[PDB]
Amino acid sequence: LRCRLPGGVITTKQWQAIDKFAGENTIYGSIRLTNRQTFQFHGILPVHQMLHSVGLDALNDMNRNVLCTSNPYESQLHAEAYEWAKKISEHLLPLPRKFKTTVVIPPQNDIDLHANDMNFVAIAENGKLVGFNLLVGGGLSIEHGNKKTYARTASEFGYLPLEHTLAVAEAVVTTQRDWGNRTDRKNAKTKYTLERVGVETFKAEVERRAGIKFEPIRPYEFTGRGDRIGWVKGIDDNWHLTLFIENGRILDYPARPLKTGLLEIAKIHKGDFRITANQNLIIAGVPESEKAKIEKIAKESGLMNAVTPQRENSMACVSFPTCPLAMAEAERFLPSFIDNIDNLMAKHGVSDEHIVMRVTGCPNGCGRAMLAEVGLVGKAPGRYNLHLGGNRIGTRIPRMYKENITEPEILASLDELIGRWAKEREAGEGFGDFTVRAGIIRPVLDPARDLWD
Numbered sequence: 416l417r418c419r420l421p422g423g424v425i426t427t428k429q430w431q432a433i434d435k436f437a438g439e440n441t442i443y444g445s446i447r448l449t450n451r452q453t454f455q456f457h458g459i460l461p462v463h464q465m466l467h468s469v470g471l472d473a474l475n476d477m478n479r480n481v482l483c484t485s486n487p488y489e490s491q492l493h494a495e496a497y498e499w500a501k502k503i504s505e506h507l508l509p510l511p512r513k514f515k516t517t518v519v520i521p522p523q524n525d526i527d528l529h530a531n532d533m534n535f536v537a538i539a540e541n542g543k544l545v546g547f548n549l550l551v552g553g554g555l556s557i558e559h560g561n562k563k564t565y566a567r568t569a570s571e572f573g574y575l576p577l578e579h580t581l582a583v584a585e586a587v588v589t590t591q592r593d594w595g596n597r598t599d600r601k602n603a604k605t606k607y608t609l610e611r612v613g614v615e616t617f618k619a620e621v622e623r624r625a626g627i628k629f630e631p632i633r634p635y636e637f638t639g640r641g642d643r644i645g646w647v648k649g650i651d652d653n654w655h656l657t658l659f660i661e662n663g664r665i666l667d668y669p670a671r672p673l674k675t676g677l678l679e680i681a682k683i684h685k686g687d688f689r690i691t692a693n694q695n696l697i698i699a700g701v702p703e704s705e706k707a708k709i710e711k712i713a714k715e716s717g718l719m720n721a722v723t724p725q726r727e728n729s730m731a732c733v734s735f736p737t738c739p740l741a742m743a744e745a746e747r748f749l750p751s752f753i754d755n756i757d758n759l760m761a762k763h764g765v766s767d768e769h770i771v772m773r774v775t776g777c778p779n780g781c782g783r784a785m786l787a788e789v790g791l792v793g794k795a796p797g798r799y800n801l802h803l804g805g806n807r808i809g810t811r812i813p814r815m816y817k818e819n820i821t822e823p824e825i826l827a828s829l830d831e832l833i834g835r836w837a838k839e840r841e842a843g844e845g846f847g848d849f850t851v852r853a854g855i856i857r858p859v860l861d862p863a864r865d866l867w868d
């Protein structure tokens with residue numbers, strides 16, 4: 416079961432409702448935070464009465480959860496951007512393939528815009544949103560050994576004033592609906608349509624349908640994709656506590672009652688929670704006076720157990736035991752895999768550094784390995800394709816480096832590479848960029864044509 420929850424914003428009352436249902440009516444008893452800012456129940460033995468009762472609804476609707484940057488550095492921008500994510504979500508509610516949309520607040524790309532069909536990049540002036548840069552056509556799904564499939568980054572269309580948001584959102588969806596491949600589902604996605612007809616042709620039709628003309632793209636840059644683990648100062652006397660939750664799996668573990676700790680926080684929390692695109696949770700809008708109380712519960716529940724920057728910047732999809740399409744373990748493999756990576760980082764004197772490392776259970780790519788600096792794509796039990804060369808901000812697809820290898824083989828490759836990066840990297844140079852500069856891996860410059868060797 417998966418819920419519609421634009422921007423990952425969920426109330427504490429709604430949380431208590433899902434917490435109950437998870438514990439009592441499911442086989443696993445867990446709440447699994449997803450990387451699209453929502454949650455899932457696993458092994459449902461209905462839910463819709465419970466969801467509906469707290470103002471929630473589980474999503475032929477070819478639409479997924481609309482994402483929104485969860486913790487902007489310019490705190491006051493969130494309310495507006497969030498309002499827009501909710502409106503787009505409602506506006507699109509009832510396509511060839513499924514349609515994924517986001518609202519991004521630079522300089523953060525935590526929502527990983529390049530994995531989505533439609534992206535509205537917020538442009539603000541004097542603390543107020545004035546418009547959006549539209550980027551269209553991202554998607555990560557591939558099929559092993561099938562060179563007709565490819566991961567693709569989103570293309571810039573142009574800038575549009577806030578007022579034209581919904582019309583533009585509608586024009587993109589309808590154009591894709593009409594132009595999308597009407598036979599082969601594995602080529603129906605927007606990324607394929609754009610490559611077939613061309614960005615300008617698609618862009619022109621969108622302008623025609625929306626009744627507008629796109630303005631030149633307004634400047635924007637991204638500095639990262641990670642969450643801001645810990646306390647950050649929000650607006651007023653408010654603070655936001657982001658908790659690192661490994662694999663977003665919320666369950667009570669012996670000596671680490673993560674699920675109960677969150678229920679306890681939900682009961683005393685003023686504001687609401689925010690599920691992030693990195694499968695973490697933000698206890699949002701905590702008044703300064705409440706910080707200590709909240710911190711006490713989170714601390715004792717094991718929710719604030721310190722982890723390395725590496726673990727904080729690693730991600731995996733659900734995979735086994737519940738995913739029917741799984742080829743290799745992802746969620747269940749990640750913890751110990753990162754234990755090994757942590758050793759390698761210490762051995763090389765870079766324990767304070769991080770590499771955006773992701774493991775996806777099969778090429779469908781839910782773990783977003785195809786936008787990682789180091790991506791592992793499951794091929795069979797215990798075997799993965801190793802991709803290198805993405806960057807920290809997620810604007811480049813990593814090329815396949817080694818194919819169908821096992822963990823021991825993966826660690827050996829990374830031990831050597833991390834060692835080279837540690838001694839050869841320039842000031843503040845990321846691992847991915849380093850592999851590309853050092854000639855370790857050829858970059859992917861135009862995915863539709865050069866992703867496959």
Ligand code: SRM
Pocket residue numbers: 417448449450451452453454455479480512513515527530531553554555556557604694731732733734737738739740779780781782783
């Ligand atoms: C939970 C999540 C991974 C995670 O650990 O967070 C997930 C889990 C699954 N995804 Fe997904 N996907 C998740 C994000 C994505 C992503 C990343 C993103 O959206 O940011 C992608 C890659 C980007 C893209 O779409 O290109 C993604 C691409 C897919 C695909 C391939 C779609 C395609 O266009 O080919 C499938 C398979 C399909 O739909 O045919 C799929 C299918 C599925 C299913 C529902 C398998 C199925 O069809 O029965 C998996 C459920 C496993 C389980 O046991 O829970 N999922 N999946 C995310 C659910 C997000 C959500 O709340 O909606």
Ligand code: SF4
Pocket residue numbers: 732733734735738739740741742745775776777778779780781782
């Ligand atoms: S990438 Fe494959 S294994 Fe992982 S959750 Fe998605 S469909 Fe399942």
Ligand SMILES: [K+]
Pocket residue numbers: 659660661662663693694695
């Ligand atoms: K996480």
